[PDB]
Amino acid sequence: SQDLSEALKEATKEVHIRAENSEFMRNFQKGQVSREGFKLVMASLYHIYTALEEEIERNKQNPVYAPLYFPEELHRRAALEQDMAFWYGPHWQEAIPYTPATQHYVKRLHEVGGTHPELLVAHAYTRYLGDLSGGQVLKKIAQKAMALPSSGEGLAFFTFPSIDNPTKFKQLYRARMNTLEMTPEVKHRVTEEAKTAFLLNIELFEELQALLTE
Ligand code: HEM
Numbered sequence: 119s120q121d122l123s124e125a126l127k128e129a130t131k132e133v134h135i136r137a138e139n140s141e142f143m144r145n146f147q148k149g150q151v152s153r154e155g156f157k158l159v160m161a162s163l164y165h166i167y168t169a170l171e172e173e174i175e176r177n178k179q180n181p182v183y184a185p186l187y188f189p190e191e192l193h194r195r196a197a198l199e200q201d202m203a204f205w206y207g208p209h210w211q212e213a214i215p216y217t218p219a220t221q222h223y224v225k226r227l228h229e230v231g232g233t234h235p236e237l238l239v240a241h242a243y244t245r246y247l248g249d250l251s252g253g254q255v256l257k258k259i260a261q262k263a264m265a266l267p268s269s270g271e272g273l274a275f276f277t278f279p280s281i282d283n284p285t286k287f288k289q290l291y292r293a294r295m296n297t298l299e300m301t302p303e304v305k306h307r308v309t310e311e312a313k314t315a316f317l318l319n320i321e322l323f324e325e326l327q328a329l330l331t332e
Pocket residue numbers: 123126127134137138139143243244245247248249251252256316319
């Protein structure tokens with residue numbers, strides 16, 4: 119049939135266009151982004167990734183994910199912790215927010231990681247394949263807007279020190295992604311979960327936009 123890496127690209131091209139042009143994003147690309155909303159986004163990602171990576175570890179030995187286990191090159195938890203200490207200070211752990219939409223996302227992550235590990239790959243895709251495609255353009259909007267150092271403090275999340283060429287790594291990852299055992303049943307559910315992952319995102323951005331509009 120059709121390769122998984124391309125079945126997912128197709129299955130999410132529509133919803134990607136709705137997320138890329140959601141209100142919050144539309145605002146971010148306008149350079150209009152306060153420290154307040156940015157910290158909000160970063161804190162939320164910290165929870166999302168802490169959940170995703172905690173589940174990837176639980177299933178790293180599992181053949182439904184194993185081929186994609188790249189902690190040293192992809193994982194964001196460590197980088198996000200550095201960003202949390204930078205934005206929220208030393209005791210950020212007891213100061214960061216945990217909004218409802220974020221909880222919904224984390225809840226789903228644990229469900230998949232605990233009971234539908236074969237779908238776990240739909241979330242690594244949505245999250246990591248995305249981070250290797252445009253954390254370059256938005257990175258620059260951020261630095262400009264808030265006056266952040268080229269050195270990287272406060273933007274650890276956006277850097278990949280162990281990956282030289284993200285485009286090339288992304289290609290490798292796609293190929294590896296296509297070596298996983300796939301059956302109609304699984305290929306169907308996996309792409310379906312990727313659309314859900316996008317919606318959880320779109321929902322999260324609508325919720326943050328709401329909060330910021332005091
Ligand atoms: C600030 C709004 C966004 C912009 C401007 C943006 C832009 C892009 C661009 C330019 C690409 C690469 C295009 C290509 O394939 O040649 C891309 C890929 C991707 N984006 Fe976004 N994106 C945005 C938001 C999102 C969101 C909210 C998600 C979901 C967390 C997301 C998930 C992805 C994924 C999964 C890919 C890789 C698809 C693939 O190549 O198979 N993006 N994005």
